[PDB]
Amino acid sequence: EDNWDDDNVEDDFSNQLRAELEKHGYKMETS
Amino acid sequence: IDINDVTPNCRVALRNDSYTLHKILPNKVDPLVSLMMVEKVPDSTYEMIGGLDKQIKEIKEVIELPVKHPELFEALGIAQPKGVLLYGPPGTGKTLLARAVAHHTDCTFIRVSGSELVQKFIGEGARMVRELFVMAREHAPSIIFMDEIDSI
Amino acid sequence: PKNPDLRIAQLRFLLSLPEHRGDAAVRDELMAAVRDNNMAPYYEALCKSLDWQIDVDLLNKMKKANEDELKRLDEELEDAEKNLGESEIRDAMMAKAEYLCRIGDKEGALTAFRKTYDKTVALGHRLDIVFYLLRIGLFYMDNDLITRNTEKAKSLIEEGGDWDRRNRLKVYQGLYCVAIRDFKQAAELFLDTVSTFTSYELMDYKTFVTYTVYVSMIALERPDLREKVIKGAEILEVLHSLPAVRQYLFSLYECRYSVFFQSLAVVEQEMKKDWLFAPHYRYYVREMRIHAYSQLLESYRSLTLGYMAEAFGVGVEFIDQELSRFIAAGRLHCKIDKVNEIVETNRPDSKNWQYQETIKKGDLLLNRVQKLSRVINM
Amino acid sequence: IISTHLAKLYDNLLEQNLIRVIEPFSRVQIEHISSLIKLSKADVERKLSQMIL
Amino acid sequence: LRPGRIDRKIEFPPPNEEARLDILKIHSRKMNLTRGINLRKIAELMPGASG
Amino acid sequence: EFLHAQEEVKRIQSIPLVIGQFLEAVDQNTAIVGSTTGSNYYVRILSTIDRELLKPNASVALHKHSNALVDVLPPEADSSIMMLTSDQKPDVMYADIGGMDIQKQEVREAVELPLTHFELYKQIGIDPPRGVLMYGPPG
């Protein structure tokens, strides 16, 4: 299984990205 | 058929008109070996059982020392004992001490139920004490555990 | 003290994996690398940290004296095997394995474990030494001892002592038995948590129930999940103890969403900041996002995504790009419409999916049958 | 202890009334259900969502 | 049975509190029980009995 | 024609057959059987009889003169003891008994409850009981 079995995703950018969007312009001025 | 293969206690078929031995039927089981006294790897208590410490020392000096020291008995010229009798109120270390002793003496533990299910075929007891001892002679250095029932 | 020896792995992973971003935790590990650890790995951190000064002085000075205290009862057995009992008695290494497995380094402590495996055939001390060896495998992240000896721990000594030793085989969770596959085996073993009171291992039983409620989210959506986590006395008791994790659970069970995303960020605050982040928690965060979108998308045939944004939080274009990734990934079966802001879902009826599964399984079976037919009779 | 019992009986009678009113319809509007139950659209919507879930 | 065949016999008393707790700990092995049962409290809970 | 002869061998069924109990099987189409007349026999078995129907000493039918195994009865034929029928219910209600709830509830959970919940004994380790013996002063 090594460390992640198989598949997954290698975008290397999705790390609480919704929280970054909420931080992006203060959630787009809280839309 | 052949004479030599005919043994005591094997089922045979007799013909209808004149009783001649037709065919030896196969036997079903030896009754004592079917219900055979189960040999276990002895799961001891690792001797933590407090309160019976006097009983621990007594069972040590009484039964363990002949197994571990044949040289001491041979040098002193003392005949090694064969059996050990235990008595008391029930539940107070009947079977537990035997298991702990058997595991600590590096021997297998054999328990004989043998109360009345054996004696249903009246003389099976006369073979029960036979074949059991045969296995206890052929398996390993071991002990035999037997209950009140013989006095019964 | 091999049962408290897991302090080695516990605090050594409490620093050594987050030591890339741990300042005070270095000082925390300072009075435990020297004062109470196994052996020469107390140096080892100089390959990552500074050169070290003082640990060269004292740690050798005790250890040879401890080797001078290692005559101990060995010579007392040499003058105590004069009794002809078993050519042995319970005085020597069999009663001295605590030092040689607690202070022994694994390059020699593995041989010490083998030495005290050549021991009495009592199942209790044997099972204890195997659990000690499993923890010693978890000391250095060997990932082979915790594979090999776990089969021995679960199956080979399974002839007695059961139904009360089984709360010590709970180490097979987070170990090589349960890797980053935070799923049915791991959550099933974690859901057998019929206990409140501590039994060492991972410490701090609140952390155990947070691990159980974290694996419960990836375990089941709601097939009888309300009985097993929501309707339980002790789990609700520790949920009364821990408020934010209770918020994380109840923002999903009540289907409130929105604030659930905030709780996810809070979970992010300890998703990787614990010791167990050398495998990644991406297969947990993405699985939780897909699970939340699946429970929202159920019971809504033609849902406008303007409603979906206010239901989940913010990010209309974020909702669009997230669904554009997840639909074409293969999960979350729906068909988003870019114009008219509708996210229309389609679900296969249960005759077509069954038809495809029968066709595929029958194809592989007929191929196997034809291969077996070609093997015999030329 | 009448608070939790009354809230629970309120919820069970809510879902019993909602399953009672919905038997004749097949494709009703949620506005008619909301007007007949004298509650807002949002609580009705989330309650039916929880009922399907 | 005394000459040669059998030998010395060992008595057994009614059990004390320590042997009672040991018997209780032995017989609670094959049972799915809670931790923290405090079997010593159960041992002092009843005054005296057999095994 | 074999299917004709398979039906044709059923002449030996006839009607006045004695009833016995099968015991053990020796070889193919030949086994021992215990007649209820008292004696024990070693008979031949017809090939028409399937071997599925014999195991736990089931009741079988034997020939009169030849004394060979011919027929297999339904699994209870001779028992000489019948069930509690349907008109033999002795019409005593549960609520007719007063003040026995400490043992009415105990005997209810010891009879019908482990029909369903049998796995709960194995995951705890009680080794579920088979019998229960009542006693007390006479009346």
| Burial bucket for residue C1 (CB in 10 Å: 0-12, 13-18, 19+) | exposed
Residues F35 and F20 sit within 8 Å (Cβ to Cβ): yes
Q: How many residues does chain C have?
A: 378
Does C164 reach chain B within 8 Å, measured CB to CB? no
Residues C62 and C39 sit within 8 Å (Cβ to Cβ): no
* Chain B interface test: which of F22, F26, F40, F57 (most B C-beta within 10 Å): F26
| Burial bucket for residue D27 (CB in 10 Å: 0-12, 13-18, 19+) | exposed
Bridge partners, F44 (sequence order): F30
The tokens describing F95, both together, are 């609520």
Nearest-neighbour CA in chain D from C187: distance (Å): 23
* Chain B interface test: which of F26, F39, F42, F66 (most B C-beta within 10 Å): F42
- Residue B61 to residue D3: CA distance in whole angstroms: 73
Nearest-neighbour CA in chain B from F43: distance (Å): 10
Residues C88 and C51 sit within 8 Å (Cβ to Cβ): no
- Residue B12 to residue B27: CA distance in whole angstroms: 9
Instruction: Say how many CB pairs under 8 Å bridge A and C.
Output: 54
Identify residues after which chain D is interrupted (C–N over 2.5 A): none
Task: Report the candidate in C262, C252, C259 with the shortest Cα–Cα distance to residue C294.
Answer: C252
Does E30 reach chain F within 8 Å, measured CB to CB? yes
Find the CB nearest B82 among E6, E22, E26. Answer: E6
**Cα C185 vs. chain centroid, distance in angstroms?**
11
Chain B residue closest in CA terms to F23: B28
Cα–Cα distances in angstroms (integers) from residue B84 to residues B75, B98, B149, E3, in the given order:
23, 11, 16, 13
Nearest-neighbour CA in chain A from C180: distance (Å): 6
Strand order in the sheet with B39-40: B39-40, B108-112, B142-146
Tell me: is residue F137 an annotated ligand-binding position: yes
Tell me: is residue B141 an annotated ligand-binding position: no
Find the CB nearest B85 among E9, E16, E18. Answer: E9
Task: For strands B142-146 and B21-24, give the pairing.
Answer: unpaired
- Residue C321 to residue C343: CA distance in whole angstroms: 13
Does E32 reach chain F within 8 Å, measured CB to CB? yes
Chains A and B touch (3+ CB pairs under 8 A): no
Residues C288 and C217 sit within 8 Å (Cβ to Cβ): yes
Tell me: is residue B105 an annotated ligand-binding position: no
Residues C136 and C101 sit within 8 Å (Cβ to Cβ): yes
Give the helix ranges, DSSP H, for C181-232. 184-191, 205-219, 225
- Nearest-10 crossing angle of helices C282-297, C316-329: 100
Q: Could you list the beta-strand ranges (E) of chain F.
A: 18-27, 30-35, 40-44, 59-62, 69-72
Residues B145 and B111 sit within 8 Å (Cβ to Cβ): yes
Does B48 reach chain E within 8 Å, measured CB to CB? yes
- Residue E46 to residue C231: CA distance in whole angstroms: 35
* Chain E interface test: which of C127, C157, C162, C164 (most E C-beta within 10 Å): C164
Nearest-neighbour CA in chain C from D53: distance (Å): 7
Task: Report the candidate in B10, B42, B15 with the shortest Cα–Cα distance to residue B140.
Answer: B42
All partners of chain B with 3 or more CB pairs under 8 angstroms = C, E, F
With CB atoms and an 8 Å threshold, state whether A16 touches C283. Answer: no
Chains C and E touch (3+ CB pairs under 8 A): yes
Experimental method: cryo-EM
* Chain F interface test: which of B23, B29, B34 (most F C-beta within 10 Å): B23
Does C298 reach chain D within 8 Å, measured CB to CB? yes
The tokens describing C213, both together, are 């409620």
Give the helix ranges, DSSP H, for chain C. 7-16, 24-33, 41-44, 55-68, 74-78, 97-102, 106-115, 123-139, 145-151, 184-191, 205-219, 225, 233-241, 243-253, 259-268, 282-297, 305-312, 316-329, 352-375
Please report where in the chains the tokens 């009992």 appear, as a residue: C85
Does A18 reach chain C within 8 Å, measured CB to CB? yes
Does E34 reach chain C within 8 Å, measured CB to CB? yes
Amino acid letter at C1? P
Does F97 reach chain B within 8 Å, measured CB to CB? no
Tell me: is residue B88 an annotated ligand-binding position: yes
With CB atoms and an 8 Å threshold, state whether E30 touches C164. Answer: yes
Amino acid letter at F81? I
- Residue A8 to residue C287: CA distance in whole angstroms: 11
Contacts of C164 in chain E (CB under 8 A): 28-33
Query: Running DSSP on this structure, what letter comes out for residue D14?
Result: H
Find the CB nearest B46 among C125, C159, C160. Answer: C125
Find the CB nearest B86 among E10, E50, E51. Answer: E10
The tokens describing A1, both together, are 């299984």
Chain C residue closest in CA terms to A19: C265
With CB atoms and an 8 Å threshold, state whether C298 touches D52. Answer: yes
CB atoms within 10 A of CB C277: 14
Find the CB nearest E31 among C163, C167, C196. Answer: C163
Does C294 reach chain D within 8 Å, measured CB to CB? no
Start-to-end CA distance of chain B, whole Å, equals 45
With CB atoms and an 8 Å threshold, state whether F123 touches E31. Answer: no
Does D2 reach chain C within 8 Å, measured CB to CB? no
Contacts of F26 in chain B (CB under 8 A): 25-26
With CB atoms and an 8 Å threshold, state whether C298 touches D53. Answer: yes
Provide CB contacts within 8 A for C269, sequence distance 6+: none
With CB atoms and an 8 Å threshold, state whether F124 touches E31. Answer: yes
**Among residues 5-24 of chain B, which lie with CB inside 8 Å of chain E?**
none
Its sign, for the CA torsion F15, F16, F18, F24, is negative
Instruction: Say how many CB pairs under 8 Å bridge C and E.
Output: 26
Tell me: is residue B91 an annotated ligand-binding position: yes
Does F127 reach chain E within 8 Å, measured CB to CB? no
Contacts of B52 in chain E (CB under 8 A): 15, 19
Residues F48 and F3 sit within 8 Å (Cβ to Cβ): no
Does D42 reach chain C within 8 Å, measured CB to CB? no
Cα–Cα distances in angstroms (integers) from residue F101 to residues C193, C202, F96, F135, in the given order:
35, 47, 12, 16
- Residue C242 to residue C209: CA distance in whole angstroms: 10
With CB atoms and an 8 Å threshold, state whether B83 touches E23. Answer: no
